Amino acid sequence: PPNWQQLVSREVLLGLKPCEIKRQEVINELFYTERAHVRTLKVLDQVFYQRVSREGILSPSELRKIFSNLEDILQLHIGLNEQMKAVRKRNETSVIDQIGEDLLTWFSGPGEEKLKHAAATFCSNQPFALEMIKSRQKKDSRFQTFVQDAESNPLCRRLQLKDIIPTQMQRLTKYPLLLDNIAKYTEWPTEREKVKKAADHCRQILNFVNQAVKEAENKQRLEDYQRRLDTSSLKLSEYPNVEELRNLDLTKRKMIHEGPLVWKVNRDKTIDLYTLLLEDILVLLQKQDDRLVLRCHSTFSPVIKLSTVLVRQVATDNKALFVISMSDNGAQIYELVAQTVSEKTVWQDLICRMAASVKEQS
Template sequence: MLIIYVFFKLLKLSSCGFQEPSNKRVKPVGKSNSLTGVLPQMKTPALKRLSQSISRSISFRTDARPLPPALPRSRQKPSSFPRRRNSQCWSDTVESHDLTAKEIKRQEVIYELTQGERQLIEDLSLVKKVYYDPMLKLDIMSESELGQIFGTLESLIPLHTDLLSRLERLRGSEKTVGEVGPTLLNWFPCLEAYVTYCCNQVGAKALLDQKKNEKRVEHFLRLCQESSFSRKLDLWNFLDLPRSRLVKYPLLLKEIQKCTPPEHPDEDYLPDALELIQNIVAEVNKKTGEAECQFYRRGLHYLEDSQRLPEIQQSRFIYCHGELKNNKGQRLHVFLFELALVLTKPGEEKDGGHVFNVYRQPLPNALINLEEIPDGEAAGGGTFRGAFTGGNDKVKNCFRVSSRGRSKFNPYILQANDSFCKQQWITCLRQAIVQSRDRTAQTSQSQLSLHPESGLCHIAEQIACGESA
């Protein structure tokens, strides 16, 4: 009976129509194709052509999709969430205007900023009404679990509603915006609330993935995903929308600044506003990286005390992590922490988190020797070739990691899923090695200045390690 109730509940919500979220990740400005999708018929041909040209150059929104066929009229109360977003640009809202091409472009970007706020508010409201509230009322998840997954999402709605109200008040009777810099400079500090929300996302994603293994949760989320209001997107797409919106602000602000003339009053505010939002995004990224590092570090299960390297505990972020195969064909989950490389085998989930059993001895990044293995090269004995190639002589997407000056450690030969994944690992490893060695060198210099005798011994040890490698 519960499933039938949920199904009809979703049908009712779907029939009312809901706002659809954007499912595209943030892309650099030059790689976008359209500001607002397909541009409707313009009332002024010259303005239309100019607007289309501008749209191709400054777009941050999803590619155009054909509109669905018109639905028969219903007597039901219309939903506050339209089924499709109105792909309208600023030029559609004015009959005609005596503006330069640069000023029209500026108005288009400001309008895109305003519309983006409106759409985000609708998306976040949808998440609460369609996902959070029903799962709580139907006892599909506990209030504590929902709190962990959704975090502070609800508190972001009034925050963005405030910005939307401010932007709409700036629009004059002629539907143009004069100064936008002071408003953004005053509002951007509110985005520091994103630190809490984004830091929670690592644990939220892990718990959500775990709960999807429960039949009732999986069934409810599947019904939602198959309904029209979700546009086939899963819950996580919605929960990740605030982070995606956050990283768009610097891009939009750069476009506004680019098409603002030198004599414009905004010239005194936009540089400061851009610097402020870039610093906020950097701080959110830093704190989120630290939270991710702590989350996975807590999940490490050491089989021996010798595996507990101080470099692991001292690491503040993770360069990358993911699945690789070893020379026996075993699937490993490898973590490249700021200061150490750790190979693990995923274990059973425990207390709402993943467990990773540490495999073999972790390596400090400063002592890593990295070697690419060209595709097709026989990189080891028969066991290696058989594990990776099924008996063929060709080996692909592999690299070797060994330890400088520690011959007792056998090298790690690892295989990525494809060439792109291999290159990502190679790039991250090289970056981690260089930065860790620079850090070690700086530490050695500090020790030398404070304790000359011990510092010289440490340098001699490092030289000896390098010669024996």
């Protein structure tokens, strides 16, 4: 329920301007939210992680697959919270005076480094954690029995396991809002700026955790696309380029970006690929049943060395990208249209940036 103003004397409040009240109202939220979080994390630990562990149902790697570093973070917040409890005692009043230093301390500097690392490992595992729960539930009388019964503990608040796991990501996500409000009602110059920066570091934490998660499933996605690949139609006899090509193993690369594209390679021959821009090559598959096909029609190969790439804009179609590939043979153009401008603009940029990143590793 209750706002900050319910606790303060009528008379205390009447000594506060109506937006110092507001800042208080928020700071209060920052703090009481943190606690709620910490409560959920605990549910996860006590209601679930701990009772299944004990029960015997899951092995010790299945355990870790599901729960991963729920401890490290639980403790992280637990401590982040007593750090806040701290800040409340500081002031004799219930008007929490200046709170800036403390926000930089929790979110900037070596606090940043702690939260982002522990976060990223927790947050990124989720995909793989959820797969397990869903699976081991169809797969096990007792494991499903167990999750069901556990879900019926009112500590859960009638959230399910799958509904509780995504939360670490969730909190991280709110930190730069709360800070931005606090900062917004902070009358004092030198200390507003502190809060504004602490917010900034809760963003940088986010991108990190975001980029953690991208990498982590992009790994598992190449593992899968590589498995549902096809190179049978690959011409033993035409361009000795082509061992590198039959033997191409998506799985040895970092995948930077992907998605479906439409290859206009002719006004009477225009393909729709599914396209991987990997770390060092660009790959041009064709979806076909499940198998994605590595092929090369009238030759233009389906793989493009990013050391040769130059991008250009097609000044008629606003969704089309002139991918030149510069060689000693010729220079082979791959004019490619996207579904929405918004895509082309990123194909353009990720390609353009890889190109120069790669060429600047001489």
